[PDB]
């Protein structure tokens, strides 16, 4: 039975997660084991660098956080939770944390390198994705949220910026900074304005249904080339979200608009993914009728777009950033705060 298979898989996956969650892996590498190639990304968190593991010649993306800045920006819990979740999860569409360690000044997350770059760049370059192209990425998100939500995990930051394309043209969810273990409800104001569910904006207690609303935003942005709610300032974006009046481009198929009306649903008792049949309301929708869910999960489906492969450490799909020094203090900074990292 196909439904008996999913239940057994999820039961084993929960058991694997709880074990790693209870006793997280720590200090599984050292900085001297790597060679820096190029800064791939920057921000308040710190930076992401393409690195080369000296012994193997293998390439990885290394996220480096400055402990002092993390403490100053009050992101200690956010940083610890990001790493604790990432080392405990295992799914084909989730970025793998290969190693983690810390020194006197920094925290290091060595992640699987995704040379295809961000979906964001590909989407802005092409303008908009066709419906079968958008469908292929959407299907991977559906299976990822089904996995995360079974572990009582809410993602909270779905957007093309947090999705990256691998060598096979398959996607990977990246940033686990806003991911949270939620048994019942949560109230924290977090996520990206364009992707926020009305209940977050309205300061209500919320759950995993916020991720299904964000899926509706993602699908709309992939298909149209722009989000369903946009404006110059976040405040003006929020007013559009709470209004809920969605306009669809004329090129959107009827099956697409229908699915979108059910995901971009203000009423929590009517939003797909949040009803009696849970994820199956989405999986069995007409828009996903040509989707072979097992073939997507098993990565057997031919991707609609395969990025230009030019070596394992190729950086052509990333923007250039100022190459800043990696300073390591002689003095141990914030030792107590990052004890569990």
């Amino acid at each position: 039975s196909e439904q008996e298979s999913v239940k057994e898989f999820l039961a084993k996956a929960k058991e694997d997660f709880l074990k790693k969650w209870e006793n997280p892996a720590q200090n599984t590498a050292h900085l001297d084991q790597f060679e820096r190639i190029k800064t791939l990304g920057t921000g308040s968190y710190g930076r992401v660098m393409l690195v080369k593991h000296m012994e193997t010649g293998n390439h990885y993306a290394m996220k480096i956080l400055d402990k002092q800045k993390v403490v100053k920006l009050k992101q200690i819990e956010h940083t610890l939770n990001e790493k604790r979740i990432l080392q405990a999860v295992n799914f084909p569409f989730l970025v793998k944390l290969e190693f983690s360690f810390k020194d006197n000044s920094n925290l290091y997350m060595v992640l699987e390198y995704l040379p295809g770059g961000e979906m964001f760049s590909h989407l802005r370059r092409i303008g908009r994705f066709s419906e079968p192209h958008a469908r292929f990425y959407a299907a991977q998100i559906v299976l990822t949220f089904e996995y995360l939500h079974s572990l009582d995990l809410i993602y909270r930051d779905l957007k093309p910026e947090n999705l990256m394309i691998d060598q096979q043209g398959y996607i990977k969810v990246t940033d686990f900074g806003f991911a949270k273990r939620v048994k019942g409800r949560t109230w924290t104001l977090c996520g990206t304005p364009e992707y926020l569910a009305p209940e977050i904006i309205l300061s209500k207690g919320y759950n995993k249904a916020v991720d299904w609303w964000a899926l509706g935003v993602l699908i709309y942005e992939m298909a149209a080339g722009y989000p369903p709610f946009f404006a110059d300032q976040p405040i003006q974006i929020y007013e559009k979200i709470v209004s809920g009046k969605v306009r669809f481009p004329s090129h959107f198929s009827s099956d697409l608009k229908d699915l979108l009306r059910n995901l971009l649903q203000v009423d929590l008792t009517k939003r797909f993914g949040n009803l009696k049949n849970g994820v199956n309301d989405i999986k069995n929708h007409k828009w996903f009728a040509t989707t072979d869910w097992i073939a997507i999960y098993q990565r057997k489906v031919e991707a609609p777009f395969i990025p230009k492969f030019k070596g394992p450490g190729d950086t052509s799909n990333f923007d250039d950033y100022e190459e800043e020094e990696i300073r390591v203090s002689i003095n141990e900074k914030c030792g107590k705060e990052f004890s569990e990292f």
């Binding site: 964001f120 957007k159 364009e194 722009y226």
Partner: peptide, 18 residues
């Protein structure tokens, strides 16, 4: 058009979390 409104706006780049 809707795309034109978006393109001319200040939110076409990578968006930060709040």
């Amino acid at each position: 058009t809707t795309y034109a409104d978006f393109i001319a706006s200040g939110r076409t780049g990578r968006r930060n979390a709040i």
